[PDB]
Amino acid sequence: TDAVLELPAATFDLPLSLSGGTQTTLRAHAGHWLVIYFYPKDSTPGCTTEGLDFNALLPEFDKAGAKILGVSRDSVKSHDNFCAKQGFAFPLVSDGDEALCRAFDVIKEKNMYGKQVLGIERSTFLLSPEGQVVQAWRKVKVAGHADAVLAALKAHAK
């Protein structure tokens, strides 16, 4: 009833490669809130702005017991470089095969250049302590976004 998106059961057990060389899974986050923000490319203006905005709010996400994960299909090394340069204190998922992206249906098509072009659409989701996707933002506008996600999380966590 409260889910806005249904994920395949296997999604929760996908090994997610993180910046720093470890893996996580969504099921491993059971018992706490998780913010998952998908972005199209490491180290670009919009995606850097978004990451820095989430980073600045970590203490507020901590207050709510929540963890954050950023996701793109860039490599672990790209992610390590992005995290180190920007000072991010949360992990980035290297979803190189787009398995996590497809589960959340963030790979979108656009008819451009006389082609059918597929790419990551900037999107964010709130995953409850029991693994339900309870809020989604798609075609995300970076300005104000992390603030809006925090506000929604606080409203839900009650």
What does the binding site for Na ion look like in residue numbers (CB under 5 A)?
29, 34, 43, 82, 85, 127
Q: For residues 43 and 55, which CB has a smaller minimum distance to Na ion in the complex?
A: 43
**Nearby residues of 16 by Cβ (< 8 Å), 6 or more positions away:** 23, 24, 25, 26, 69, 93, 95, 100
Q: For residues 66 and 120, which CB has a smaller minimum distance to Na ion in the complex?
A: 66
Ranked by CB distance to Na ion, the top (closest) residue is: 43
- What residue type is 45 in one-letter code? P
83 is catalytic: no
Catalytic entry in 16, 34, 47, 103 = 47
Distance CA 155, CA 117 (A): 37
Closest approach of Na ion to the CB of residue 33, in Å = 6
Q: For residues 85 and 110, which CB has a smaller minimum distance to Na ion in the complex?
A: 85
Which run of H or of E encompasses 114? none
Closest approach of Na ion to the CB of residue 79, in Å = 10
Distance CA 76, CA 56 (A): 22
**Where in the sequence numbering do the catalytic residues fall?**
47
